[PDB]
């Protein structure tokens, strides 16, 4: 048994159903098939029990055409059709945080997630704020558990989108940049600080806020600007920001603060301000109640 058994000897490429040993061709083809699987997955009925079974069913549908172990957890020994047996009870991180659950810690953690969702009835019959506070605890825990050999982020995100949908809310992760995701997660894992993650879940659940970030991202694409490496967020109620006026749109306006993009509602600007405001102007904005 060995973690090494997941990759072709003398390479860094994961054994796959296509037999691609060249890393980038494997990535493009696995990416292509996983796109196909997500579109079709969007057509299945939502489960009655959100649990570890459902998590593994999602991973299995995403990666079944790529990996023999689609849907298998990494601390359970998996035997390839070639005869070798792989597992990775400990998956070390280069340079990173407190890292990931090890071995039996994965198992315990998943049992806990199973118990919690079950006693709280899949987080249903809650308001949006209630749902988000519960969801955040489960999301941080699944972040640490990281139970699959590969594809953990994609499976977890789909799990929490569908979980919110069945509880009558939404989580729109396509509005979150790679930068902001990493800031929020390491604030949890490193500093014990939940605020960035709570603010993340608020921006992508609040309908008023989703409209604003939708417009901003749409503009960025039409501009041909890639913000995946920058913080993008909606101004928090009561906070003040000071920076460079970035322009305005039908629904919202953008502020630029030490490289970050801060989105706010146009109706919250003083109309005596909006009138003469030019891109590059230095403005201060306090978001209201």
């Amino acid at each position: 048994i060995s973690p090494h058994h997941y990759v072709y000897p003398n390479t860094t490429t994961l054994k796959n159903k296509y037999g691609i040993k060249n890393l980038n061709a494997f990535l493009e083809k696995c990416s292509h098939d996983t796109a196909k699987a997500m579109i079709n997955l969007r057509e299945e009925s939502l489960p009655e029990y959100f649990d570890t079974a459902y998590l593994c069913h999602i991973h299995q549908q995403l990666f079944k055409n790529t990996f023999e172990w689609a849907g298998y957890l990494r601390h359970i020994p998996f035997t390839f059709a070639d005869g070798t047996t792989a597992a990775m009870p400990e998956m070390k991180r280069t340079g990173w945080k407190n890292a990931f659950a090890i071995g039996d810690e994965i198992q315990e953690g998943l049992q806990r997630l199973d118990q919690t969702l079950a006693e709280k009835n899949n987080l249903q019959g809650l308001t949006r704020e209630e749902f988000n506070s519960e969801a955040i605890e489960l999301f941080n825990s699944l972040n640490q558990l990281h139970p699959f050999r590969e594809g953990n982020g994609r499976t977890q995100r789909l799990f929490f989108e569908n979980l919110a949908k069945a509880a009558g809310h939404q989580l729109n992760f396509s509005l979150i940049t790679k930068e902001r995701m990493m800031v929020a997660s390491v604030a949890v894992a490193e500093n014990g600080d939940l605020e960035p993650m709570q603010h993340l879940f608020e921006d992508i659940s609040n309908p008023e806020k989703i409209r604003l970030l939708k417009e901003f991202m749409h503009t960025m694409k039409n501009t041909g600007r890639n913000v995946n490496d920058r913080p993008v967020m909606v101004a928090k109620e009561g906070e003040t920001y000071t920076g460079t006026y970035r322009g305005a749109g039908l629904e919202g306006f953008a502020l630029n603060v030490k490289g970050a993009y801060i989105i706010g509602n146009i109706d919250h600007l003083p109309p005596e301000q909006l009138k003469i405001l030019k891109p590059g102007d230095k403005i201060t904005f306090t978001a209201p109640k």
Binding site: E28, K36, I39, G153, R157, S174
Partner: protein, 56 residues
């Protein structure tokens, strides 16, 4: 129908986004077939046939 276009738009945006959050950009044939379904010029059965037949 508009509601359906809404659904598929979100669905392709989510596919693209969830890879970008891993540092992955999709192959241009992948983006072309996805965009044809979001528009959509293609039913889901046709979109699946074109994803199956793409040569990367």
């Amino acid at each position: 129908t508009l509601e359906e276009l809404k659904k598929r738009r979100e669905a392709v945006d989510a596919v693209i986004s969830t890879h970008a959050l891993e540092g992955i950009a999709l192959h241009p044939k992948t983006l072309k077939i996805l965009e044809g379904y979001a528009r959509g010029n293609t039913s889901l059965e046709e979109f699946n046939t074109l994803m199956d037949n793409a040569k990367l």
